[PDB]
Design an enzyme around this catalytic site. Structure first.
Site, PDB file in Angstrom:
ATOM      1  N   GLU A   1      -1.345  -8.314  14.908  1.00  0.00           N
ATOM      2  CA  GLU A   1      -0.367  -9.245  15.466  1.00  0.00           C
ATOM      3  C   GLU A   1      -0.816  -9.664  16.888  1.00  0.00           C
ATOM      4  O   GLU A   1      -0.605 -10.822  17.308  1.00  0.00           O
ATOM      5  CB  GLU A   1       1.036  -8.628  15.499  1.00  0.00           C
ATOM      6  CG  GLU A   1       2.090  -9.518  16.174  1.00  0.00           C
ATOM      7  CD  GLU A   1       3.483  -8.868  16.035  1.00  0.00           C
ATOM      8  OE1 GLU A   1       3.877  -8.031  16.885  1.00  0.00           O
ATOM      9  OE2 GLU A   1       4.158  -9.145  15.020  1.00  0.00           O
TER      10      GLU A   1
ATOM     11  N   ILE B   1       0.843  -1.190   0.000  1.00  0.00           N
ATOM     12  CA  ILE B   1       0.000   0.000   0.000  1.00  0.00           C
ATOM     13  C   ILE B   1       0.887   1.252   0.000  1.00  0.00           C
ATOM     14  O   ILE B   1       1.919   1.283   0.678  1.00  0.00           O
ATOM     15  CB  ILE B   1      -0.909  -0.078   1.260  1.00  0.00           C
ATOM     16  CG1 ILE B   1      -1.611  -1.440   1.365  1.00  0.00           C
ATOM     17  CG2 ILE B   1      -1.901   1.069   1.327  1.00  0.00           C
ATOM     18  CD1 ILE B   1      -2.551  -1.766   0.227  1.00  0.00           C
TER      19      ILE B   1
END
Lengths: 288, 288
Positions: free
Chosen positions: A246, A66
Site C-alpha cells: 500500500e 490465502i
C-alpha cells in the site's frame, strides 16, 4: 474493447444537468488534475451503462485468498454477484493456495470464475511482494486477452450496494476510509528516505487504499510492475515499507496521477467508522 | 504524443486537495457522465502543464477568415500569443480566401503558422458545409502527422486570459454563453424531424457553441466527418438546420458525449452579457 469506434447512444429521457447547481455541496467531486472523484450524486448510471455496454466491456476482478482467508470467499463472491458490474461481462480471478477450498458460487449469465494457484513461498519477503508480482505476470498470461479493465480488491469484504462502470477509467485509486478527512502530514505514507516508497511531509494528494485499485489492463500492468520492482529494490536495501504494497501504491499514484478517484463509499469499515452523513451509500465494506 | 509511456512527475509542492470542501459551491463541475466541466478553481495548472509537457504535446488551432473577416486575424493571433497554450508547441492553421491579407504576427519559440487557401465556392450550401468539410479533410493532409490535439474556433474573437492544457481531452465542447443557465426547451436546437440535426424537446444535456470545440485529431476527424455527412443529407432533403453547423455539432455531442466540457469562461460576449459573478475569468471573448 476500449477506445474503439463507437456508435451513437440511443435517445434517452433523463433530467437536464443543472449548470448553476453543484451536484454535491459537501465534498470535492473533481481533483486538481481534473479526474472525477466518484460519489453518489455525481453520475447518471443509465448513461454510463449505455456507453460501456456499447463497447462490449469485460471487467476482470482479482482477489487473493490465502490460508484462513479462503473462508471469506463465499460471502465476497455471492455479494459481488448482486452488486458488482451487473449486466456487463465479468471474469473473476481467485488467486489461492487452496484451490479445493474455493466455494461453488452460482454465477449470472456472462460471468465466469477462474482459480489460479499461488506458490506457498517460505520467505515472508516473497509473500509481501506476491500480489503485485502475480498481478503483473498475469497481465500477459490471461488478462490482456480476456478483459478490458482490472479491479484488484481484498477478499475480507462484502458488497452491500452498487459498484459499477462509473469506476472504470485508465487508472484509478480509492480514498482510504481512515484518512479521507485527514491532513497530508497525518497520512501514513512511508517517511524514511531510504525506501523507494518515501513521500516527504509536504507532498501527497490523497491516501489511497491498497484494498481497491484498478484501471485498464495496460495501466494496471505498469502500476504492478513498478510496485514490484520498487519492493525488490527495498528488499535488497534491507528496508520494508511501513504499509507494504500500500505504501508503494501511494508513491506510484503520487507520481502517476489516477484518471478517476473513488470516494470511501467504495472502501469502508462500518465497525470502525460507523455511517457518516457524507456517505450516502456504503458500497464495499469490511467483514467484522 | 497521446497516451504513450509516461515518466513520473517530479516532486512538486502545492496545497493539499480538500476532500470535504467543494472546489465550487455555485456551479456544476462534473457532468452526469463524469466529464469535468472546466471552470476557474477546478484545476491546478502547474500539475496539468507538467503532465502535458512530459508528453511533448503539440496543439493545432484552426481558424477560418473569409472576406472581411480577415480584419480580425491580427488581434486574434496577437492575443493567442499571449494567452493560448504558452509553453507548449502550437501550430496555427489559418484557412482563408485571401492568403496575402494574413498579417505578419511575431510568434514565440515552438509556435508556427500555416496559411491554407479555401476555394471561393459560388453556392451558399457549399460555403455552409466548408468548415466541417475542410477540417475533416485536413485531418489526413496535415493534422494527423503534425499535432496531437485540435482546437477549432471563430476568428472574430480575442483572448483576454489563460486558455491552456486544462481543455485538452479526446473530445470537448463549450457551453454557449447565451444558454448556460437556460432550460433545454429554450435551447435553439434544430426542432424539425426532417433534419438530421433534430433534437426533441425532452432531450439534450447542454447547448454547445460552434465557435469553440476540439479534441484529439482522431475524435475531431470523426466529429467533422459526421457533421459534414449529416449536412449533405439535409441538403439533398432540401432542409438547412436553424444554426447550420452548430445545430449538427449539438446533435453529435448529444449522441457522442464529450470527455470534458468547457465553461462559458472559454466562449463569452461581454457587450451582450456583461461580466457576471459566476465568471471568475473571461478568457476568450467576442470582438464588438
Amino acid at each position: 474493447a476500449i477506445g474503439e469506434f463507437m456508435v451513437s447512444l440511443p435517445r434517452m429521457v433523463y433530467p437536464q444537468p443543472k449548470v448553476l447547481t453543484p451536484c454535491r455541496k459537501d465534498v470535492l467531486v473533481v481533483t486538481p488534475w481534473l479526474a472525477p472523484i466518484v460519489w453518489e450524486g455525481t453520475f447518471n448510471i443509465d448513461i454510463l451503462n449505455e456507453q460501456f455496454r456499447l463497447q462490449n466491456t469485460t471487467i476482470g476482478l482479482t482477489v487473493f485468498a490465502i490460508k484462513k482467508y479462503v473462508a471469506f470467499l463465499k460471502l465476497f463472491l455471492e455479494t459481488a454477484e448482486k452488486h458488482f458490474m451487473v449486466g456487463h461481462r465479468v471474469h473473476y480471478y481467485v488467486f489461492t493456495d487452496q484451490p479445493a477450498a474455493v466455494p461453488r458460487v452460482t454465477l449470472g449469465t456472462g460471468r465466469q470464475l477462474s482459480v489460479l494457484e499461488v506458490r506457498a513461498y517460505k520467505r515472508w519477503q516473497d509473500v509481501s511482494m506476491r500480489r503485485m508480482e502475480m498481478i503483473s505476470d498475469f497481465c500477459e498470461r490471461r488478462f490482456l486477452s480476456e478483459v478490458d479493465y482490472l479491479v484488484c480488491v481484498d477478499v475480507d469484504m462484502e458488497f452491500r450496494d452498487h459498484v459499477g462502470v462509473e469506476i472504470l477509467t485508465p487508472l484509478f485509486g480509492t480514498l482510504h476510509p481512515g484518512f479521507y478527512g485527514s491532513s497530508r502530514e497525518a497520512f501514513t505514507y512511508e517517511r524514511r528516505p531510504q525506501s523507494q516508497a518515501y513521500i516527504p511531509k509536504d507532498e501527497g494528494d490523497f491516501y489511497y487504499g491498497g484494498a481497491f485499485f484498478g484501471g485498464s489492463v495496460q495501466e494496471v500492468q505498469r502500476l504492478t510492475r513498478a510496485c514490484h520492482q520498487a519492493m525488490m529494490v527495498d528488499q535488497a536495501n534491507g528496508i520494508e515499507a511501513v504499509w507494504h504494497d500500500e505504501s508503494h501504491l501511494n508513491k506510484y499514484l503520487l507520481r502517476h496521477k489516477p484518471t478517476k478517484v473513488l470516494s470511501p463509499e467504495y472502501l469502508w469499515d462500518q465497525q470502525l467508522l460507523g455511517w457518516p452523513a457524507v456517505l450516502r451509500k456504503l458500497r464495499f465494506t469490511a467483514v467484522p
